[PDB]
């Protein structure tokens, strides 16, 4: 048997960031200035995005190494926060539209945007950690779902097949291809197992802004005409559900849960379209 439905916990105090680490402009503001930026980045921006991406990947991997029964989601946030700040990076989530922590922790039925808190991870859980770094005036965004203890076969396979859907989508990225191939590959692969691909939350372009206005759909919609071109940077971040797509948001305004409480898994990388294919910017 696995645990029952989750409920929210208490948050730790706000974690500070040294003043010499520049903040994204949206920290301390009610909204973010994003969504109208170019989709192809300059070579100087891309080089800085490699640095941001590798730092985010390191924070993700260090917090992921700590996932085990008995650990709180707050303790994962502390690890990610300190990794970023020791690397001179600001955690992009912290202060984005008032989000109170440095990463998102989404267990089990939480589709995305779970808030690190007193919640204790237990055996059988699947834990998504989502970390973004802001450094050099650019962002790097990545997430992964990590098993805690011995996970039930249905949940283990959900995580492994979500990871594989993500990698197959990444491996389609090439200049001249339609962006819509990403969602076609994810949803074709998920539908083999009878999983449902979340639609309402998407991948996105990323650069000097966190969400630049480019949308990357994870389901199949061949009417989108956008093509991949060298220098475009975006995330692929599919959420895949064992149950129905219907969802609720907690009173915290962030945490998104499946209405049937069936579990869901996600992986994310920030990608660069190169002249021949793709480069993952959020690798160690
Ligand atoms: C699944 O979650 C992704 C997500 O919301 N996509 C939808 C992005 O919608 C847009 C689009 C499509 C355009 C603009 C201009 C702005 C937004 C938020 C995130 O990008 C996630 O990867 C990120 O780590 C977390 C960010 C906050 C918790 C701080 C929000
Ligand atoms: Mn993310
Ligand atoms: Mn993202």
UniProtKB/Swiss-Prot annotation:
SUPFAM superfamilies: Creatinase/aminopeptidase (SSF55920)
Catalysis performed (reactions): Release of N-terminal amino acids, preferentially methionine, from peptides and arylamides
Protein name per the record: Methionine aminopeptidase 2
Keyword Cell membrane in record: no
NCBIfam families: met_pdase_I
Manner of cofactor binding, per the entry note: Binds 2 divalent metal cations per subunit. Has a high-affinity and a low affinity metal-binding site. The true nature of the physiological cofactor is under debate. The enzyme is active with cobalt, zinc, manganese or divalent iron ions. Most likely, methionine aminopeptidases function as mononuclear Fe(2+)-metalloproteases under physiological conditions, and the catalytically relevant metal-binding site has been assigned to the histidine-containing high-affinity site.
GO aspect biological process, one term: proteolysis
Residues annotated to bind a divalent metal cation 2: 141, 204, 237, 268
Assembly behavior: Monomer.
Biological source species: Mycobacterium tuberculosis (strain CDC 1551 / Oshkosh)
Top-level taxon: Bacteria
Keywords: Aminopeptidase, Hydrolase, Metal-binding, Protease
GO CC, alphabetical: cytosol
Positions annotated to bind substrate: 113, 211
Its biological purpose: Removes the N-terminal methionine from nascent proteins. The N-terminal methionine is often cleaved when the second residue in the primary sequence is small and uncharged (Met-Ala-, Cys, Gly, Pro, Ser, Thr, or Val). Requires deformylation of the N(alpha)-formylated initiator methionine before it can be hydrolyzed.
Annotated residues for binding of a divalent metal cation 1: 130, 141, 268
InterPro entries named in the record: Creatinase/aminopeptidase-like, Pept_M24, Pept_M24_MAP, Pept_M24A_MAP1
EC main group: hydrolase
GO molecular function: initiator methionyl aminopeptidase activity; metal ion binding; metalloaminopeptidase activity
Cofactor: Co(2+); Zn(2+); Mn(2+); Fe(2+)
The keyword Transit peptide belongs to this UniProt entry's keyword annotation: no
Family: Belongs to the peptidase M24A family. Methionine aminopeptidase type 1 subfamily.
Assigned EC number: 3.4.11.18
First and last residue of the signal peptide: none
Classification via PROSITE patterns: MAP_1
Pfam families (UniProt xref): Peptidase_M24 (PF00557)
